[PDB]
Amino acid sequence: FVEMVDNLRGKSGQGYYVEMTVGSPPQTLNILVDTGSSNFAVGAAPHPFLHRYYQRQLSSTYRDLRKGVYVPYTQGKWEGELGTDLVSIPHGPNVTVRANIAAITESDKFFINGSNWEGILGLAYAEIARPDDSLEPFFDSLVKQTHVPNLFSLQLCGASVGGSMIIGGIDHSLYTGSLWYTPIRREWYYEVIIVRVEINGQDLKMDCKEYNYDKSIVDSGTTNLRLPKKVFEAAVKSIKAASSTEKFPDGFWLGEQLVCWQAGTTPWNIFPVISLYLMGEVTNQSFRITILPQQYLRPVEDCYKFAISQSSTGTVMGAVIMEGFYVVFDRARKRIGFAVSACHVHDEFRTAAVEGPFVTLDMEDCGYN
Numbered sequence: 630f631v632e633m634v635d636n637l638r639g640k641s642g643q644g645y646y647v648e649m650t651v652g653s654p655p656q657t658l659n660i661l662v663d664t665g666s667s668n669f670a671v672g673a674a675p676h677p678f679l680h681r682y683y684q685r686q687l688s689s690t691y692r693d694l695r696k697g698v699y700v701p702y703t704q705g706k707w708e709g710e711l712g713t714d715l716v717s718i719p720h721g722p723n724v725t726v727r728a729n730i731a732a733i734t735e736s737d738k739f740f741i742n743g744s745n746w747e748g749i750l751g752l753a754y755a756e757i758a759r760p761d762d763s764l765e766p767f768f769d770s771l772v773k774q775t776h777v778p779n780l781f782s783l784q785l786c787g788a789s790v791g792g793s794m795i796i797g798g799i800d801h802s803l804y805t806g807s808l809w810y811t812p813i814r815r816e817w818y819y820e821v822i823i824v825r826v827e828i829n830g831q832d833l834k835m836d837c838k839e840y841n842y843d844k845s846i847v848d849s850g851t852t853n854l855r856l857p858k859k860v861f862e863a864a865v866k867s868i869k870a871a872s873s874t875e876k877f878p879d880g881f882w883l884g885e886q887l888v889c890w891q892a893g894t895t896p897w898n899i900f901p902v903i904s905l906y907l908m909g910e911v912t913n914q915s916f917r918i919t920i921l922p923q924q925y926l927r928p929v930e931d932c933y934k935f936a937i938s939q940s941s942t943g944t945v946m947g948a949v950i951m952e953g954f955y956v957v958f959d960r961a962r963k964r965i966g967f968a969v970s971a972c973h974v975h976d977e978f979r980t981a982a983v984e985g986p987f988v989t990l991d992m993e994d995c996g997y998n
């Protein structure tokens with residue numbers, strides 16, 4: 630899989646993208662890797678922000694589906710025209726597939742000014758595809774039409790950031806130690822269940838049901854570790870108490886302002902390790918993933934933003950989490966694998982860890998219904 634190593638690029642806070650081609654002859658586009666959505670959508674009109682866009686008139690293999698899509702989000706939206714065409718991943722497997730493409734013809738607050746991407750690769754399941762679950766997502770199409778195994782893995786590293794998307798397999802040089810798997814609870818988002826949360830080694834004492842209300846997901850499209858309201862409130866309270874050597878304004882924890890120490894005077898050791906215990910493969914068995922402050926304190930263009938925030942969507946395990954680990958999306962076995970990333974940023978002291986097994990009872994009770 631050396632072919633596919635280091636095939637992800639991006640800037641600080643604007644996601645990870647992969648190179649793709651679309652149409653015949655192939656048109657090159659940089660496409661955002663997003664495990665929290667299910668649509669394959671690309672710019673198809675000359676928006677001022679775009680380096681390039683999908684030109685349907687140029688592709689002999691384009692077929693119109695005569696159907697539109699309006700995709701609203703909390704803030705902003707994109708609208709598009711549905712069709713199919715030949716899609717390929719230059720630094721992926723040596724295959725070409727007919728996938729659904731949403732050609733974006735109108736948008737608001739989707740494209741980033743300065744960004745180097747022109748579309749989005751939704752890698753989640755059909756249920757959350759717009760307009761409905763009959764629009765087959767790209768990966769489902771890939772597996773159906775080829776001999777590529779039904780799995781992919783992500784190593785998100787990190788001005789410029791980089792990483793790897795291994796399609797149809799695992800590259801063991803991207804992780805140290807051993808992979809531990811948590812089950813995909815249901816195939817819509819990549820849903821998982823958190824059964825315990827520790828900060829610096831001390832339990833939060835919360836009913837695990839509230840760790841997963843109403844969802845817990847693994848999402849390469851989200852920057853922050855997003856926690857549910859109550860969980861966030863208890864977490865920061867505990868993180869504030871853990872770091873009392875220095876004090877910061879009430880706004881910094883809410884991500885409303887910035888914190889600064891220059892000269893390279895970053896006292897990481899004042900800040901606690903966060904740990905998430907996830908449901909294991911076996912009854913009553915769990916494992917834990919541990920992230921360093923150098924994961925939830927990201928540099929801003931030395932100054933840092935607190936990258937843990939509220940959510941009424943549930944727990945979102947974003948780039949803050951994923952950058953510490955090699956993440957295997959084992960779709961074939963309905964499981965997600967975590968192992969310590971070979972590229973995660975640590976100091977000479979603490980590291981990111983994936984440890985187990987642990988004994989945890991009543992894990993099913995942690996899922997919301």
Ligand SMILES: CCC[C@H](Cc1cc2cc(-c3ccccc3C)ccc2nc1N)C(=O)NCC1CCCCC1
Binds near residue numbers: 707739945
């Ligand atoms: C708990 C899940 C968090 C996850 C965050 C997430 C938001 C996104 C939002 C957009 C998007 C769309 C239109 C306009 C502007 C933006 C910024 C694109 C991609 C997105 N990718 C994401 N992973 C989420 O809200 N997913 C549900 C939907 C998936 C399909 C697109 C709308 C959002």
